[PDB]
Amino acid sequence: QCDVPPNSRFDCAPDKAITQEQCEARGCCYIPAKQGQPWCFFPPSYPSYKLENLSSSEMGYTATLTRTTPTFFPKDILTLRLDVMMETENRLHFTIKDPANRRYEVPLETAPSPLYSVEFSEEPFGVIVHRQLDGRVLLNTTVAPLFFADQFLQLSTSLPSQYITGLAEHLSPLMLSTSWTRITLWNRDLAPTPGANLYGSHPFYLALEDGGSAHGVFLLNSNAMDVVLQPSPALSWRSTGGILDVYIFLGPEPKSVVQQYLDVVGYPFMPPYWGLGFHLCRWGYSSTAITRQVVENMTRAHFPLDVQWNDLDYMDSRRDFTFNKDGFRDFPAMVQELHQGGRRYMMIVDPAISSSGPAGSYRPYDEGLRRGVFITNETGQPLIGKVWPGSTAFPDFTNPTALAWWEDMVAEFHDQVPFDGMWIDMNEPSNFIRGSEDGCPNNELENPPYVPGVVGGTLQAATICASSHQFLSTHYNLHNLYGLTEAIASHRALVKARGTRPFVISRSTFAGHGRYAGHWTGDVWSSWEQLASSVPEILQFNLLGVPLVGADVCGFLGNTSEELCVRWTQLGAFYPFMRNHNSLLSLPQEPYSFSEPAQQAMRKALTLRYALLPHLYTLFHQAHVAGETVARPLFLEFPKDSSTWTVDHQLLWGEALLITPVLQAGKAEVTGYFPLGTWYDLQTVPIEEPAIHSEGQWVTLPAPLDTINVHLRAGYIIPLQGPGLTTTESRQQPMALAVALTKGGEARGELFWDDGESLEVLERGAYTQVIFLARNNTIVNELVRVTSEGAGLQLQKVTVLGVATAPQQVLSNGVPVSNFTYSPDTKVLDICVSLLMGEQFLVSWC
C-alpha cells in the first residue's frame, strides 16, 4: 500500500508541517526522502470521491460524485455534480460543481470523430482522456484524490512528457521544471525575480508529446492557486476557491493548441499600426520642455519614434486625470504638437483614486463616491489604501456603474489632453500598505485554511483585503481579474472617447487579457540576465494570446551600460511591443545618449524594424483573425524536431524570420539552432555567409557589436516598406518584397493592409489582402481582396535570394526592367520595378 515510487508520491500534508504519527493518523504513508518530495503521501486507497449514476446525453455525460470520509480540510463538499461536454472535435470541457449551492465562477463570454476519447474511473474517481489517433494518455485524474472543499480544490493528472509550458507570470525558462516545482498564481507587485508570483496569472498549460503533437489544459479559475509539478511526471492544480472548470484542447499541432485555447478566451485585439512603432518613456521627464527635447534629440539623430510617453511626472500631486501647472502647464499644446508632427502620445494611469482632498475639489473621487464605484469594506465604506497620491480608494471594475464612471473620467480628461491610449500600471492592485489603512478583519477569507506560496506568506501582502466587497463577489475570488477588468474598462473608454482602435498596455493580466490589451514585463533590471530572460517571457505571452508584449528596452531598474543597451535594442527591436523605459534615478538610456558607434547600431535596429512593419502588422492580423502567435518559439513551428523543444534564447517572427541575439557581454559570436532548411542572411537584402543550409543543427555565427543575426526561411516572401521617423511618414513610402527561394524555386507570402486605426475593418471589409508567389523563375501577386485602402501601394523593389545563375534578362509585365543587379557571391538578384500591390503583376527572369 505504501510502496509508491518516490516520483509518484502526492503530498498528503500540503497545509502544514506534519509528524509520522499525524501522517499515519490522516490515513497517509510516511517515508522520509533520502536527501520537495513529500515525506507524507497518499496511498492508492486514500479516500476520494466515488462516481455514481453516470449517464449520457447528446452533449456528453453527467454524474454524481460522493465523498464518504472527510479530508483534513474543513468544509468538504461531500456531493458534487460532474458535467462533461464534448464541445468540438478538438475541445473537451468538464465541470465539477456543488449541485446544492451556486459557487463563484469566473465571468467569461461563451473520418468524423473527436480527436479525444473520455473514460471514467469509478472509485477512486477520475477522468481519463486519450488521444484517439495513437492512444496516448493525456489526462488521468485517477492518479491522486479529488479534494473539493469550500476553500481548497485539488485535481491532479499524469503529464505525457517532461515538457510543459505556461502558467504565467513567472521568471523562468519557457519549459517549466518538473522537479517538485510549486508555481503560484496570485497577482503581485514585485520586480521579476525567479520563484515568485508576479503581476499576472494564466492557468493554462501546453504539454508536448513524444513525436511532436501537443495538447493544452485551461482551468477557468481566478482564485489564488498553486500548481505543483513533480517528475513522474504529473501536475496538481491546488486552488483556494471557485469550481473546477476544465478545458482540454487536442491540437495536435502546438500552434493549433494555442488557437483552440484562444477560441475560448478570445483572439488578440488588432493594434493600430502606429502602436508597432518605437515608444520612448522614462520616469523623470519632469516638464513639457524636457519631454519635447526627447523628440527633438531623437529626430536630430535620425532615430524613428512614433509615440512619446510620460510617467507620473505629468500629474498634479500624482493624481489621475490631472496635470500640474508648473512643468506641465502647457500639456495640451505639447500633445497637439506631437500630433501635428505625425506622432502619438501615451501616459500612465493608475487604478487608485486619491481620497484625501477636500470634498468637492477632485471630481474623479467626488463622483466616484457619489456613484458608489469603489471597493468597500465590512461596514460598507470605501476601502482606503496607500499609493502614489497618498490615501486612495480602489475602483471596482466589476461594477457596471464604475465602468460608466471610468468612461466619463477618461473622456473628460481626453477633452483636455488628446492622449492616444492608456498605460495602466499598479493594477494587481498594488497597495503600499498591508490590506488597508484600517487593517483587515479576522475571517476565513483573510486567513484561509490553505495559503498558496505567495511572496509575503499572506493574500493581503502588497494589496487590498481579501474580504473586501466587489459587485460580483469578494476580492478573494476576483483579485486575479483586477487588472483584466481594468483593461476591459479602459478598452471601452478609449473606443468611446476616440472612435478608433484602442491602445492599452497593462501590467497585471489574467487569461484572455490579449483580447483587450497588451502587456509589458514590469520592473526588470538593466542586467544581461534579464535581457536573456526576456526572450522566454515574451514567447510565453504569445503562447497565452497576448502577442503585444515586450520588456523595457535596455532595462528599467539600475543603470544600463552602452554594450548592454546595444544588445538590448537589437533584440528588443523584435519584441512585438517595443518601448524603452527607465526608472527615476537611473542614468539616461535614450538612443541619442550613447557614443556614435552605439548610436549607429541602435539606428540600424530601429530602421530594420520599421522596414519590417508591413510584415509585423500582417502577423498581428493573423493573430487577430486566426489565433496565431506573432513571436513564437522554434518548437511551435518545428515541433517534430525535438532539438527545438528547449530552445528559448532564439525566436521566430511568424513562420519565416529567425532571430538569434547575443545575450551576454563581451561576445562577438553566437551559437543558435537552425531547423532543417535553407536560411538566408537578411543582411543580404538591401535596406535604406549568404545562406545557411541546415540539416537541423547548431551553427556558430559571427555577431560583432554592430550586428544581430536575422535569417529568412527559404520558401517565404516578406513585404517591406521604405523609411521614416514615424509610421505616418513610413506608410507613404514605396514597398519592396524579399523573396527567399527554396532550392526548387518556390516561395509564398502575404500582405494585409488597411487604414491602420479604424474600428470594425474586417467586419466592414475595409482592407486589402494580397498573396505573393514565386515559382519557375517568376513572381506574381494574387489579389484576395482589393479595396480603396490598398490603392496606390507602390512596389518599387523586388529582392530574390537563392538565384543560382546570373540572369540574361529580367522582365516586369513583359518589358525588360529599367535595371537589376546580380551578385554571384551572394546569389542575390535585386530588381527595380514600378508596380502596384493591388494590380496583378508578373516578374520573371532567365
Ligand SMILES: *[C@@H]1O[C@H](CO)[C@@H](O[C@@H]2O[C@H](CO)[C@@H](O[C@@H]3O[C@H](CO)[C@@H](O)[C@H](O[C@H]4O[C@H](CO)[C@@H](O)[C@H](O)[C@@H]4O)[C@@H]3O)[C@H](O)[C@H]2NC(C)=O)[C@H](O)[C@H]1NC(C)=O
Ligand atoms: C472602512 O473604511 C472606512 C473608510 O472608508 C474606515 O474609516 C476609518 O475609520 C477609522 C476608525 O476606525 C478612522 O480613524 C479615526 O479618525 C479620527 C479623526 O480623523 C480619530 O479621532 C480617531 O482616533 C481614535 O483612534 C485612535 C487610535 O490610534 C485613538 O488614539 C483616539 O483616541 C481615537 O479613539 C481615528 O484615528 C478613519 O479616519 C476612517 N477613515 C476615513 C477616511 O474616514 C473604517 O474604519 C473601515 N472599516 C473597517 C471595519 O475597517
Ligand SMILES: *[C@@H]1O[C@H](CO)[C@@H](O[C@@H]2O[C@H](CO)[C@@H](O[C@@H]3O[C@H](CO)[C@@H](O)[C@H](O)[C@@H]3O)[C@H](O)[C@H]2NC(C)=O)[C@H](O)[C@H]1NC(C)=O
Ligand atoms: C490512470 O491512473 C490510474 C491510477 O494510477 C491507473 O490505475 C492503476 O493502474 C495500476 C497499474 O496498472 C494498478 O495497479 C496494478 O493492479 C493490478 C491488479 O490488482 C496488479 O496486477 C498490479 O500488480 C498493480 O498493482 C492499479 O490498480 C490502478 N489503480 C486504480 C485506482 O485503478 C490507470 O492505469 C491509469 N489509466 C490509464 C488509462 O493509463
Ligand SMILES: *[C@@H]1O[C@H](CO[C@@H]2O[C@@H](C)[C@@H](O)[C@@H](O)[C@@H]2O)[C@@H](O[C@@H]2O[C@H](CO)[C@@H](O)[C@H](O)[C@H]2NC(C)=O)[C@H](O)[C@H]1NC(C)=O
Ligand atoms: C442514483 O440514482 C438513484 C435513482 O434515481 C432515480 O432515477 C433517476 C434517473 C432520477 O429520475 C431520480 O430522480 C430518481 O430518484 C437514486 O436512488 C433513489 O433515491 C431516492 C431518494 O433517496 C429514493 O426515493 C429511490 O427509491 C432510489 N431509487 C433507487 C432505484 O435506488 C440514488 O440515490 C442515486 N445515487 C446518488 C449517489 O445520488
Ligand SMILES: *[C@@H]1O[C@H](CO[C@@H]2O[C@@H](C)[C@@H](O)[C@@H](O)[C@@H]2O)[C@@H](O[C@@H]2O[C@H](CO)[C@@H](O)[C@H](O)[C@H]2NC(C)=O)[C@H](O)[C@H]1NC(C)=O
Ligand atoms: C546609477 O548611477 C548613478 C549616478 O552615477 C554617477 O554618475 C555617473 C555618470 C557615473 O559617473 C557614476 O560613477 C557616478 O556614481 C548612481 O547614483 C549616485 O550614487 C552615489 C553613491 O551611491 C551618490 O554619491 C551620487 O550622488 C549618485 N549620483 C546621482 C546622479 O544620483 C546610482 O547609484 C547608480 N545606480 C545603481 C543602482 O547602481
Ligand SMILES: *[C@@H]1O[C@H](CO)[C@@H](O[C@@H]2O[C@H](CO)[C@@H](O)[C@H](O)[C@H]2NC(C)=O)[C@H](O)[C@H]1NC(C)=O
Ligand atoms: C537633448 O540634447 C541636448 C544636447 O545634446 C541636451 O542638452 C545638453 O544637456 C547637457 C546636460 O548633460 C548640458 O551640459 C549641455 O549644455 C546641453 N546642451 C545643449 C546644446 O543644450 C539635453 O539634455 C537633451 N535632452 C534630453 C531630454 O535628452
Ligand SMILES: OC[C@H]1NC[C@H](O)[C@@H](O)[C@@H]1O
Ligand atoms: O509609475 C512609476 C513606476 N511604477 C511601476 C511601473 O512598473 C514602472 O514602469 C513605473 O515607472
Ligand SMILES: [Cl-]
Ligand atoms: Cl517526525
Ligand SMILES: [Cl-]
Ligand atoms: Cl460569490
Ligand SMILES: [Cl-]
Ligand atoms: Cl513541492
Ligand SMILES: [Cl-]
Ligand atoms: Cl491527433
Ligand SMILES: [Cl-]
Ligand atoms: Cl541538440
Ligand SMILES: [Cl-]
Ligand atoms: Cl516595371
